[PDB]
Amino acid sequence: HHHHFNLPPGNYKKPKLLYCSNGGHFLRILPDGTVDGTRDRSDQHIQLQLSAESVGEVYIKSTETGQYLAMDTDGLLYGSQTPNEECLFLERLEENHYNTYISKKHAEKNWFVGLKKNGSAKRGPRTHYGQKAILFLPLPVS
């Protein structure tokens, strides 16, 4: 593995908002497949159903559209209609508190799901350990 295995608590029973404290955005998978953050708690596209593949591996699915969060070969987040290798993330605890999501496909490159302060998604290679953009808190929903 090229990553630790501190796992966050809690479970996948209910959908979550993935709140990025960096700019205070909820991770959003828009119907057109683009991914960004919004501060709008009422947004219909921020409700995410996570599910485990292996322990510590998750899919992150829009409950509204069914799209899976994915990170493509060039590090861009997108919404995938179907689950593929780009859709698996290594969900970890970080700073003893947050959840981070590393692209499993690109795990060796330490490509994370991250949101910038303006709510734009980080491109995988622009992420790294230690960043704020990568730190999410899973909140309740709808």
Query: How many other CB atoms sit within 10 Å of the CB of residue 14?
Result: 14
According to the annotation, is 22 in a ligand binding site? yes
C-alpha distances (whole Å) from 57 to each of 31, 60, 100 are: 24, 10, 11
Helix, strand, coil percentages in the chain from 3-state DSSP, rounded to 5: 5, 35, 55
CB atoms within 10 A of CB 123: 15
Output the known binding site: 22
Indicate the annotated binding residues for heparin: 22
